Design a protein around this ligand. Structure first.
Ligand SMILES: Nc1nc2c(ncn2[C@H]2C[C@H](O)[C@@H](COP(=O)(O)OP(=O)(O)OP(=O)(O)O)O2)c(=O)[nH]1
Ligand SMILES: [Mg+2]
Length: 868
DNA sequence: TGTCGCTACAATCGCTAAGTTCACGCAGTATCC
């Protein structure tokens, strides 16, 4: 009678169907000897409200205090007489429950007795501020059905579920293969210790041509790759894709090449040629229904792909739109709005993976557009078709097939990127840790993950969580650097998980720090037991430590090493976001006093460590909120390691959980400012042999907002300055290289790509006020003016500042590289680069350097020293 | 419709206020009527 399946996604409609949640997942059907998508509708999820009784009865209007003690019987009688009649509640089940509370609502005791009352989700929802003569507060009034279900059944991310006494649906309600109806939450249970089942992953790339007549993006091809046995707990398979299907349509007025049909037939691929976008969309929807993928992956899927698909479906009136998801509906949610919420609702039941968002979360790159990711991750070169060539493709079979194969290659690259970063396993792990839904986790962001983690933690410990909500404080202390150049051995000491460790050691929790509704609250007493937040953060820290230890294994595959590093960084960021959400104004658990206490303890710890190290007769030259840089004044590495171990042990002796570890040994350092230095990191190889690795932190050479020419010049200068050559030779080489770069720029021998400068966008180009015209924004608008895919918020834009004879400021002459290559009145402003891109960076680098100054750099670059 | 925290640096733009130059008065000498 039981029903075991692996649930992946959950969907709830607060307005359409009250008290109903649909769970989508995989179920093993023995006859087919494979998993089939199944949907389970958990109905009758009653809403629970906790009422806080008063100590004594109070008159409602007079605001008096009669003095009659208020018991649970009196509370129930009042709710049955006044409130039940007032708000038209017919049936409700009432019981007395002893629950805890420690959050930001005044006059609520830590532990007290409440009258839990439930009733159907069809009944009206009580107001959040409801009060009465016998009760002073009502909680959980705005509790969503999904949250109630997840917290009641203790479901934490994807996992196997067992359903008792399943029912059959009267009529089909989902596009899946198996359906089942659960009459109550209590009939659903969780079964642990079972491997996740392989899922279907569909990677799709589409090419569109915009109609300037209506500024509508019309789809002309969809190249899609599918793998039916993609694992969620193992390494990506090779080859990453099993089979594929291609669909290619024509425009409204253009026609196919002469012998397109014969060439397509000879190609032997699964090419299905749809005459019109309507037939193409119908075929795509039928294919999606047949495959029924569980994880649809793409690039800009949430921003461009799904939005265009749904808009064209609506325009062409493709009958069964709801097949894009897994539920059966008739009315499409209104498009637009912020975020991909419309897209997510449209694709309900399918986990949408946007490798753009995932790449932004996982790695750091100068640009996040597909070509840059392909070059950086896969180390391949991507051929880009200009939109004019896409329009002109309808003139020969060869070019049309080239366009289709380019779409196919883009889809393959998207799948390869998804597999390389290991996005799906990491999403599963983080979802299990947090306990939210996987689609939200893959949508990005840290607030929901930590919020659901703390929801699960507090709920399981008999606590009433706060109702969902419908530089504030000081931070870390940065030591004043001893700016200069150091040629001896510098020993770096860095704390491990400093803020998690502070939370653990000092027992900082909602139930331990007695706040008061900007003074740092008192530390908790050492008598109290460990709180919920220390326990959760300790679990996170232990998981990260386990991953790091697993990384230390010798002879590891470099790809597996990078995957482990990414996972460790993700866990570190998860813990740091758990800390940060305490100081998030819109968070469910906004506890600014707790964050202030944590930061104050961090500052105190750093100050104490600095004082201890200085009291040890050692030199301290830098430190950023958890770290210290020490000038050993030694040239032997063994003594450096010995002293480092001694000082690390001495510092660790004063703490119970906080530990200090030797971060690295720098043979040479260039301390310029706060958060700006370059060093030759030393990694010992053995038998007294060590390898020197360069390391730049915060310099302009490691920033995407500078031209690659300036970055190259600064890198060469830093390499020379950090070398062991005599100073005179270093200065001579710097002069020679600067003269060479000046000659190259003056003679136009530099490659054009070295002039690009990248600046990201915060809002849409339209939403930027008319604050003159910020360079990138300027170019951004041009890109939107031109006939190409628009540029939205959070998109990098590479522009080249060029001469136009305008006698205007540089910031108002920013242009795209294609603009320069096209227009005959635009030329690269050589003087601008030589004076404001190369000179500033090298001058900043060489500030503490003897023999080099701004005037000398200008002279070597061929500029006029006068102004400098 | 959501949206982790804070600290630091750097370029750009607007504002604006001190600093500067250029021009108006007085005194003297001189030339030229
Ligand atoms: N909220 C938040 N806090 C951060 C972030 N990055 C760093 N911090 C805080 C918490 C860290 O413990 C502290 C020191 O930074 P670290 O990069 O050395 O990380 P941490 O010491 O926690 O761990 P680790 O040294 O990598 O083992 O600064 C962040 O992105 N968000
Ligand atoms: Mg650290």
């Amino acid at each position: 009678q039981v029903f075991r399946f692996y649930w992946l996604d959950a969907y709830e409609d607060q307005y359409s169907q009250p008290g109903v949640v649909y769970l989508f997942g995989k179920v093993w059907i023995e006859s087919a000897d494979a998993y089939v998508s199944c949907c389970v509708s958990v109905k009758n999820i009653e809403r629970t409200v906790y009422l806080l009784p008063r100590e004594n009865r109070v008159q409602l209007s007079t605001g008096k205090d009669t003095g009659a003690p208020v018991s649970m019987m009196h509370v129930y009688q009042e709710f049955n007489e006044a409130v039940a009649e007032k708000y038209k509640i017919m049936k409700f089940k009432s019981k007395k429950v002893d629950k805890d509370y420690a959050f930001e609502i005044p006059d609520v005791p830590a532990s007290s007795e409440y009258l839990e009352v439930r009733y159907s989700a069809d009944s009206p929802q009580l107001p959040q501020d409801l009060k009465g003569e016998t009760f002073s507060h009502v909680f959980g009034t705005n509790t969503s059905s999904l949250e109630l279900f997840l917290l009641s059944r203790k479901i934490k991310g994807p996992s196997w579920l067992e359903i008792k006494s399943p029912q059959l649906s009267s009529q089909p309600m989902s596009w899946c293969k198996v359906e089942a109806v659960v009459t109550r939450p209590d009939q659903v249970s969780v079964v642990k210790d079972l491997a996740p089942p392989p899922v279907v992953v569909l990677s799709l790339s589409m090419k569109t041509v915009q109609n300037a007549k209506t500024h509508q993006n019309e789809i002309v091809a969809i190249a899609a790759l599918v793998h039916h046995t993609f694992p969620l707990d193992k390494a990506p398979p090779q080859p990453p894709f099993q089979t594929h299907f291609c669909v290619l349509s024509k425009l409204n007025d253009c026609i196919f090449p002469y012998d397109y049909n014969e060439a397509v037939k000879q190609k032997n691929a699964n090419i299905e040629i749809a005459l019109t976008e309507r037939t193409l969309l119908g075929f795509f929807l039928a294919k999606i229904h047949k495959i029924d993928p569980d994880v649809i992956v793409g690039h800009d899927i949430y921003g461009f792909d799904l939005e265009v698909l749904l808009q064209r479906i609506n325009s062409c009136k493709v009958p069964f739109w709801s097949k894009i998801g897994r539920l059966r509906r008739s009315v499409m949610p209104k498009l637009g709005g912020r975020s991909g919420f419309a897209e997510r609702n449209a694709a309900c039941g399918r986990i949408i993976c946007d490798i753009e968002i995932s790449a932004k979360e996982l790695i750091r790159c100068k640009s996040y557009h597909l070509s840059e990711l392909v070059h950086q991750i896969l180390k391949a070169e991507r051929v880009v078709i200009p939109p004019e060539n896409i329009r002109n493709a309808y003139n020969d079979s060869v070019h049309l097939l080239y366009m289709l194969e380019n779409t196919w290659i883009d889809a393959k690259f998207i799948l390869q990127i998804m597999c390389e970063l290991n996005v799906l396993p990491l999403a599963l792990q983080i979802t299990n840790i947090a306990g939210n839904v996987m689609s939200r986790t893959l949508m990005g962001g840290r607030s929901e993950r930590n919020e659901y983690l703390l929801l699960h933690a507090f709920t399981e410990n008999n606590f009433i969580v706060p109702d969902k909500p419908v530089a504030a404080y000081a931070g870390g202390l940065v030591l004043e650097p001893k700016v200069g150049f150091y040629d001896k051995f510098i020993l770096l000491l860095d704390f491990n998980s400093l803020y998690p460790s502070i939370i653990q050691e000092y027992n900082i929790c909602f139930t331990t720090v007695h706040r008061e509704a900007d003074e740092i609250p008192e530390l908790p007493h050492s008598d109290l037991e460990m709180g919920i937040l220390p326990r959760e953060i300790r679990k996170l820290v232990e998981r990260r430590r386990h991953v790091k230890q697993l990384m230390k294994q010798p002879d590891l595959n470099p790809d597996l090493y990078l995957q482990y590093d990414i996972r460790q960084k993700a866990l570190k960021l998860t813990a740091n976001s758990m800390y940060g959400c305490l100081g998030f104004s819109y968070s469910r658990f906004y506890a600014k006093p707790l964050a202030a206490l944590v930061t104050h303890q961090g500052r105190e710890i750093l100050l104490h460590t600095k004082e201890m190290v200085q009291k040890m007769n050692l030199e301290v030259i830098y430190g950023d909120t958890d770290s210290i840089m020490i000038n050993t004044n030694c040239n032997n590495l063994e003594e450096v390691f010995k002293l480092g171990n001694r000082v690390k042990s001495e510092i660790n002796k004063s703490y119970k959980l906080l530990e200090i570890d030797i971060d690295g040994i720098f043979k040479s350092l260039l301390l310029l400012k706060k958060k700006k230095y370059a060093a030759l990191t030393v990694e010992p190889t053995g038998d007294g042999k060590y390898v020197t690795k360069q390391e730049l932190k915060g310099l302009d050479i490691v920033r995407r907002d500078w031209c690659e020419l300036a970055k190259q010049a600064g890198n060469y200068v830093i390499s020379q300055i950090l070398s062991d050559q005599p100073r005179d030779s270093i200065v001579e080489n710097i002069q020679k290289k600067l003269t060479e770069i000046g000659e190259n720029v003056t003679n136009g021998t530099v490659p054009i790509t070295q002039y690009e400068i990248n600046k990201a966008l915060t809002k849409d180009p339209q939403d930027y006020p008319d604050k003159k015209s910020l360079p990138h924004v300027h170019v951004a608008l041009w890109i939107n003016s031109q006939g190409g895919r628009k540029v939205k918020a959070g998109d990098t834009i590479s522009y080249v500042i060029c001469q136009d004879g305008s006698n205007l400021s540089a910031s108002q002459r920013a242009y795209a590289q294609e603009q320069l290559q096209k227009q005959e009145n635009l030329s690269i402003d050589t003087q601008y680069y030589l004076s404001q891109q190369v000179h500033p960076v090298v001058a900043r680098i060489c500030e503490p350097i003897d023999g080099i100054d701004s005037a000398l750099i200008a002279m070597w670059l061929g500029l006029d020293p006068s102004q400098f």
